[model samples]
Target: GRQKARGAATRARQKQRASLETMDKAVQRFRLQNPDLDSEALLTLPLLQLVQKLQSGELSPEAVFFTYLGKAWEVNKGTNCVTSYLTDCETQLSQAPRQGLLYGVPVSLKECFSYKGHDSTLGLSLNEGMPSESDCVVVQVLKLQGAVPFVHTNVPQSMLSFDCSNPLFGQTMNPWKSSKSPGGSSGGEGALIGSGGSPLGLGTDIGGSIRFPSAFCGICGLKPTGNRLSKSGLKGCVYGQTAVQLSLGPMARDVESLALCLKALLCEHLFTLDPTVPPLPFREEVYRSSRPLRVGYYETDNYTMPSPAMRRALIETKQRLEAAGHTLIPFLPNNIPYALEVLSAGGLFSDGGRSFLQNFKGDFVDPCLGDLILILRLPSWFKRLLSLLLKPLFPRLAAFLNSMRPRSAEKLWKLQHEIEMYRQSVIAQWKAMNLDVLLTPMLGPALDLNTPGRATGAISYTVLYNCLDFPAGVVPVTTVTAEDDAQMELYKGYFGDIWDIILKKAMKNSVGLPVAVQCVALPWQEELCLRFMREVEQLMTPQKQ
Candidate 1:
């Protein structure tokens, strides 16, 4: 069995290398042929500025595309974020509508997005040469709007881990700290966009995948409410698992750009292409409104506690919002534990991880999936035994493990109903509190790059919204400080379990790494979400000065 697995893995790696080399060689030839277009100055502008000049004819789409390609190769040299350069950018630029919103902007995508003639390997050793039949609806929309899809970025193996490394494309590094992860499964988009390799990117998130990388890389990303955007062309481990649905949205360096991408994509054309998509246009009034906002915030959740830097980012952001004349309140959401239980571990394992395990067969499974996979593979009785054994000191975690097991069809129905009920409860709480937005810390600056597999518990802060299917966004506030790394006393007395201890160890030497906080709103409230994120971004800068 192991021998077959090794051979499959070897074949996958060879295919990946050949595919990458082909893409890289194309980019190389473009640069060699068009040396005049290679300019670092072009990479320094905001995405909109680049788009404006392209529209004004001050800059040609081909020239801008080349500049990004040159820089993308450089970005890859350092971070290995890019999976394959889609050679179709040249065609995209030439055929682009002269007056389209995204005219000539180069966009990067998470590796899962299907682009014709390119493999969406998803870091798997399998399916390396298998090219997509055509652009997914998302890419089709991008092309219609005159945006160029130039690159597909890396992701964790199986696209299930928060750490951005897999057997196929290797590890994608954080731009700020090479030793740290950029976050995943949307991580390569995070790294590429964070490093200015691409102006805009698309990523899908069910459990903090978009915002985690955006936070860790100090960029901005949106996890829109499920079904708000097209998810037709993306790939993931769990398909047809609707309990906690994955959603697609934009990630970029600033709020305006995020707004721009959303406005362009959420249109009649998109709705017509995918009739399942709601005909909700971007609401300008809500986003542009200057009225004072009512906000609710929490520094920690029921399960995981924030590290000092993470905690500080929230506290400092709270102070800025207060000074900006926004009202703030404390709201502890009802049944967060239930939400976490059913969505995070329960949703993933409801099929007893049979499908998850099956996908990794004959391929090299990521180490980041090691712990969860091991636990998933364990028999129910043995898992319960471990739960009982660990209950004395790790009551919270023990109870959590005890609650995770294969669910019958009826049990799955009950969990789905519970998820809906919890969503209603949270909405009621938000209405009762009169909160315009809820604020929480985005997970981390770093998890031990050596073993990110163990720190999956940290997703509690970001995944809660996914459970509720709310629009969520992340805005970077500051970086880790020497003081942050100096000492943290939050959980001084004890380590409740392996996760708590592992996070504590991972948080060490994390100074100068990026830290961010999340902004969330009720379903289809993305305008309000971005409005809150914009306010936070502005207030954060003025407060720092």
Candidate 2:
């Protein structure tokens, strides 16, 4: 049975390759028919501008579709990011309404999003050959808004790790540096959009999945408050992990693109398609307002120290926001270290990795998951003994390890109660500060390939937002400089523990990689979060110039 499953995985991979070849041939034929197409000019237009031209009939859907198809093909060739090209895109192009908000815009997708006749494997062999019977709600919304779903991207196994590699479609590389990971679980979207393969994309995040990849790839992404968007057909390894809910949001080349995508998706179609979602349309006034705001910022969460570039990005962004007439106040999240040890570590793995580990049976496990698998398979008594031994030297590591064991229903309820209390305390702190938004580091620059498995602690910055269900967005602020690299050598993590050492080491040689800062707002205030992100992007862009 196991060998047969492996064979199915291999056959599934073969089918994906065959689909890629077919798309390449189709793109070549389209290029031959339209020899005068200026794909470069088409690629440079922002999502909104491109839609404007499409609405005005200045750009035909087919031309724009093929231009992006060709680009996606080329990008996938280099980054190994694309899973399969949507063959039905041609039919979508023909039916796209000239008046729709995202008319003719090509969007990429994280592999977990279901599309009819395509496998949303989350990079697991167990899911091989199981094509979805119908499109997910998100895909249906995209099509209804006239956006063409052109390609699916790779993800880490189990969609849990920040690194983007699996045994299925393989690893997706950072477009800027092939040696570095693009970040996950929406990593393929990050790599593709960062490489200009697609104008926009959709990615789901339970714990920094969208923001991590967006930061690593130097693009823009938003994790709207949980339940703001529908997750009707998104696939995942763990089914009942509801303590931290999964959120679906957009990734794009810029903040405005993400804003527009959100506007388009928060339509009547989505509300009608998924009654569970709140019927909240995108608030234009909140996003477009020009009032000065009280912004809170922090350089480090005290659990994991940010790399030099990360600190620099935050300092520079804070300075820029102050100069622009906004109030910048130093704000520290309450008990981040405790939250990481208890809420995040305990809540996410409450089932003791039972469901996560089950997904790997009869499958080729990716090397990136080796440590996690080992930890999951550890006998409870042995884990408790090891945690006790490590406690004297590395309390943080010991606490994390000790929290990874299975939990009873009573323990799960207590964990959920603790999470609720933490969220309330954090919000109370924010309210006391009278802050309009928050700015923080979005991890260090992209880590070297396979490094995320060791340095998962670095996600403390983004995971906090997930735990609280706050809307967060990442905007690329700067690139890693030589000076930043030099400073990274001096980082002796908060605890000098395993995570700290691993994170510092992983950040080595990261010069020239993209670094970003995260902007956050309270639940359902996605517009405010996006407005802050756009402000950061606008300010930082001039510095680059």
Candidate 3:
């Protein structure tokens, strides 16, 4: 009875193996061509420095491409982050302009981006061999800017879960600790960049896909306003859900890299390629300005209280910013639990996950998605009864459950209206506070493998920004220490619900894992967000020194 599914999986694995063979051949060719290339030293240079070297002909595109390709091969063996290597790098390099913003820079792409003749499988066996007829607009822009798209990375099934594993590519391990996940659907990009395999990567975030991986992997990432970047080339299981729109942004080792990537992507070519994206180039004056003003911050969202390490990162970041001539104002997020409900029951799953569920019909579902799929498959009446039972002890959880049932067209419309109102209210608050930016916890430290399935609700910290459609970014500040892990015992979650209990347990033995703080700016103010991220990075750097 299950033989067909097993056969499909075998076929998919064979295709993956073939791709790996092709990648190996390419790496070998590069090695043969450049025997004296110092890949180690090249990998250490900042992204912009590499760009300068390439522009001045101090480095050759072939050498940089092969160096990162070789490094990615080594990193993928342990992390399983790579889905396949793009075979068109040589063609692109041959055609690349000698001088451009990202000349000779090799970038990694999240698997969902379409490249001609490559399958954007999104971890589904059914899509294993289906190839795109043409490159996506983002890929076109990358090529226009002289950046080489060398490899495609992994994603969770349905591109919904924060855990990065799918039947087709298996699990992607954290580079810092093999036992932990690097966070998803951008998890693969996180692992690849964190291990120094690639200087930059592109990832999409609706609910923290970009920021979570950055936080977990000790890197930097930005989630620009939903419409700031093009979404033309992305493939997703949920086709038309727009309540929480996806924001495509960059992931790299530092804030400057993120800024540079965005600057390059915001060119006239991007606007011309996709007319739907507004013609707003990167604002250099906003990003480079040194003026400091009021900053709003909160340690917890009153939904899921941050782990001790997360709280420490936020507080320390707040203190550092204050010492650097910026004002810190304590601001508590209002109605965060309601926001979480809107994002899930009201926004993402308005169809009761019908679109998301259909992808797994003939596929081998990953273990990390087991709990989520189970809940999504529950009948409406049963879910309502369960919610009623849970209400007295866990009102928030009950509300969340009740919201998950399939929504009628009228209800979905109402939710859209509610979200708009919520956004307006949040913007009003920001204006009221007169804040230049906001600082908050990114999340708890990196989760152990397979644990994110149960602990998904902890994304409240990052999801809030997506709900608001605000530009936000994450910067690594510190790591979880023995004391921080010990203090997790004091966390009494706002509702003491099952999610909180799971989070507390999931954080055990997390010592030495990286922790980060998120910075938020007003809608469409990406440059402002990056400026604050740079400030945090600079302040944190001297402390380390």
Candidate 4:
């Protein structure tokens, strides 16, 4: 079966993981050989500096495009950060600028996005990574607006988890920690931007695929309202779940650069490319002042426990925001458990590995998912037998599962209805409160770089926003504290849900790692999110900003 094959290949790949180091060495060698090349020639210059250079003619659009193409090629080899490297990328330079908003910024799309002339692998090896015959509407819109797509980034096997590893492209490791994973399916973009090799890239966030990795790697990422950006041509493991729409947004090294990339896409002109959104232009008027606003703050969503560092960051953020004259108040559980139950009860993984294997055809499965999937394939009788004997062996994992068994079609429909109702209720609450934005931790805690994410799925905090279709943006608040983590080491939990308890175990000793907070705004209220994040960043480094 494809499952066993994938498991075998994955094991082999782990044993033969030296190629990534070799690839990194190759990039250094290339840089040394091309010493005459301007290493900082890539697009998305440090905002203020870039504007000066562009005006002074020190950097041209042509130079920005090819220079990034060159460095991206090197980064791609080192990390497989990129999948598709264009040949005629220079042609984009020859065309008139037309005063496009994102004009000439070099951006890479995750391979999961449908792009013409490239296959949208969604990170499954069963497919040959074939290029699509046509582009997704989002890709076309970016190109038409003068944003150049020179490369495509890698993703996970099924885009189902937070780790970015697959059979075809292999696993993408954190540039900082070789043993740790780069959060996925947008993890590639996070790593690319983190390495200072690429400035801006596109990634989809359903759960934390976009935000978590960005937060993990210390970058900025946004998730617009459902279908705010098109998902037209991509193929994926979770393609059938339209109830939780995956949104494509910008990932960048800094909040300002992120704003530049986002404004370019959301300009009133985008209505032509994706008529699904209202023709709202970059409302510069919304961002201009220094006015205090009402902000609601919550350390935990009550659905799961957050990491020690994540908890501190959220607590710390409130003081800073309050000091800045913003009114921060307490928030009770938003009845998220209801939506959480409905979503879990839907039996998202009910296929029992069959649908995943279908993508592989006669080929073997990728091991990133591992033998842990056997729990999914085993019969009820066998599972009960194993549970009795193996129960104590992996208690942390076995007891944590809240939703078990596949559900009927009718149940799935009812679950979707509950999701819709939950979203509406939350919206009404937010409106009634008249809060400017809501603050929540990115996840229970900073994820462990060495954690086996597949065996213990960890997409709780951020994915919830995707279900609600909220425009969420993540910004770093603080790093894990040594003292806080020292305290976390003695933690114990009695939670019945597997995920919630797993988070408790992993969050311990997460000190010194980075933690982020999410600022979620109303639907299509991206301007609101960006404005708030920009302020947060400004306070973090006042003189620097």
Predicted structure 3, TM vs. truth: 0.97
lDDT of 1 by residue, 412-449 (tens): 88878878888888889889888888988788886656
Report the poorest 10 consecutive residues by lDDT, candidate 3. Answer: 1-10
**What would the per-residue lDDT of candidate 3 be over residues 325-413, giving only the tens digit for each residue?**
99999886678888897554568889888788888786677888747888888998898899899889878778877888898899888
Q: Write out the backbone clash pairs for model 2.
A: none
Candidate ordering by TM-score (highest first):
2, 3, 1, 4
What TM-score does each of the candidates earn? Answer: 0.94, 0.98, 0.97, 0.83
RMSD of each: 2.4, 1.4, 1.6, 4.9
Name the TM-score of candidate 2: 0.98
User: What C-alpha lDDT values do all the predictions have?
Assistant: 0.81, 0.88, 0.86, 0.65
Q: 521 in model 4: Cα distance from truth in Å?
A: 1.4
Candidate 4: list runs displaced more than 4 Å. 1-44, 48-52, 70-80, 96-98, 238-240, 344-357, 360-367, 370-372, 378-409, 444-457, 493-512
Where does candidate 2 have its weakest 10-residue lDDT segment?
536-545
Give the CA lDDT, 0 to 100, for residue 359 in model 1.
68
Model 2 regions lying over 4 Å from their true place: 542-545
Report the number of clashing residue pairs per model. Answer: 0, 0, 0, 13
